[model samples]
Target chain A: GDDRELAILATAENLLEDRPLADISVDDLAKGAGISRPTFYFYFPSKEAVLLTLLDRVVNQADMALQTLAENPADTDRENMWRTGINVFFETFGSHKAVTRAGQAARATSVEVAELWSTFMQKWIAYTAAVIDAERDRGAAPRTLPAHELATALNLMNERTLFASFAGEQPSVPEARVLDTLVHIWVTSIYGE
Target chain B: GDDRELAILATAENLLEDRPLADISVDDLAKGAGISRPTFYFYFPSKEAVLLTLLDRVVNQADMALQTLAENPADTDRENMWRTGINVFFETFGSHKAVTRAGQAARATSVEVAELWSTFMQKWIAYTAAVIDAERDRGAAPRTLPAHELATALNLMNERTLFASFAGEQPSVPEARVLDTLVHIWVTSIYGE
Candidate 1:
């Protein structure tokens, strides 16, 4: 049962890389999984379920992007720490831009997806807040705008920037300059340089 | 002919304030406008057209928010200038949150709205960049990020923060603290406090 479900998910994921989640239908999932339409339904209730499943993987990878900053931050230079964290964030999310796009769209129409994404956002916000406070604790960064408040604004910045870039929203941050621009803002804003 | 069309648009605008855009329908709009369903279509092709029309007004108002800043910077306190600009921005957009929400959704499905919004963003970015460059000229702020790049990131921040707050996304910035927080980041990031 799980094998068929996993196969269906992989097939959907493969197709999503090439096309949009909207373009991949149930028939496509079933055919790619070598299962009947009814069998596909038995494994997963809908295309959104598969997209959510794919998103779970992407979200976990994004979590690791933060975890890469070690528990002990004594050795890492401040700017490099932020640059690497942001780079990993972009790489992880950008790798599955289609899944992220679908998840974003799904939020508008699906209560379940919206709740899950909300939970993810809350978790990431807390994670970012902790990182900021940790830097402050080490005397590398100043106390400004309450750690949590600054974190909320900066995290929103990251989300908006990445989404606009991935969605190819016009007047978007130039791809060549985006990472450096983000790093500069992050380092300067938090470190007061 | 124009009265009926303006009536339909006004009706849609009034209805949007009390309910989600998804909850309002063509019949609801037509009835509110005191027009037939066919007549409503004759005036505006779809509900989205009315939403876009409403958005045009909000977008223009938002533009005015920026123009409030004086050309002569000698008189105004730097922080006050930003606080006023950001406050007006929030007030203008938040007053028509539902319309902004629908416009955001429409962009996902409407190429015309997306293009219009992109043009708006580019114009604002250039406007913001000019402001930053002017402040730098007076030796009030340092040249860190290119004026345009910093403007792009900060404007994106404003848009995302406003949208998330208006949409009531969870883990959102606390309403009471949002303005001060944004002002702080703007002043600190650009002026290097």
Candidate 2:
């Protein structure tokens, strides 16, 4: 029972590497997983459902990585910690381009995933703001923009840059350059001059 | 002939304040402009056409303002100029939330507007990057991130922040606060401590 659902999920992931979720139909998903179209429905209500599950997994993994990093500060210096945070996002979103693309496309139309995304984003932002505040309190960082506002702006910057790049838009920085650039902005803006 | 088109444009602008473009129909637009529904087609092909015109006008005005500022730098200092640029966006997008909202909504679906917007955005980013390069050449700014990359990141931050605020998303900064916050980020990140 559960095996079939997992099989369909794995097949969808593989197929997304070749084409968009829109191009891959239920038949293609079912067939790739050694099942019928009807059986695909048994596992997923639609292609969107499979994409949503993929989205959920990717986001959850990123969140867990961030949360763990946030909880354990002894493992790295401040800049390295931030570098790791940025890397987590870049790797998570970057590695799963197919899922990220499909989810973003679906987000434009799907209320379900969009709402899920908004909630996820809010929690992430709040957590980030709290960390910024804590750093300032410890005298490790100087206050510039309010912690929350600064966190929000920086996070939004990362989100837009990554999303635009993944979407194959113009003015995209290479992977190495983009990662360093974002870390520079985040560190410099939050820490003192 | 021109009068009817302008009138329809103005009417649509007004309607957008109260409701989204999706809610307003062709009949409503035509009726608001004191023309029959069939006559609406004579001036513009559809509601989207009128919005496209509105978008074109707003963007052109912003471009002129920024160009004039960039050309005449004697009047204001560097930080002030940056402040003015951020203010211009806030004012441009804030004052005409209706058009901005409608245009953004349309941008997601309309190929014409999306293409138009993409070209417009590329030009804007290029111009902003050029200014950054000039600043670094004068030794007024640091050589942290590449000029084009930093400019792209900063501009995208402003775009996402303003758009999210206008869209009534969560964690939005108040108008005054958001402007000051954006200017702070841009100045500190570019000019260095």
lDDT of 2 by residue, A18-105 (tens): 9877689999989989999887887789998899999999999998988887777757678787888888889888999888877866
Per-prediction TM-score, please?
0.91, 0.90
The 10-residue segment of model 1 chain A with minimum total lDDT is A65-74
TM-score of chain B of each: 0.89, 0.93
Please, what are the lDDT tens digits per residue for candidate 1 over residues B1-193? 8889888878887887787677889999999889899989888888888888888888888776566554444366888878877786688888877688778777766788878788888988898789899989999898888888888888898888878877777867877778887887777778873
Top candidate on DockQ is: 1
Query: lDDT of each model, Cα atoms only?
Result: 0.80, 0.82
Best by TM-score: 1
Compared with the true structure, what per-residue lDDT tens digits does model 1 show for residues A80-154?
777777787689888877788777767767788777767877877787788888888998788877877777788
Per-residue alpha-carbon lDDT of candidate 2 for residues B1-193, written as tens digits (9 for 90 to 100): 8989889999999998998777899999999999999899999898888899999998887878777867777577777888887777788778888898777667656778778777867877787788888888998887777778888788888888888877777656555578877887888888874
Fnat per candidate, as a fraction, reads: 0.73, 0.58
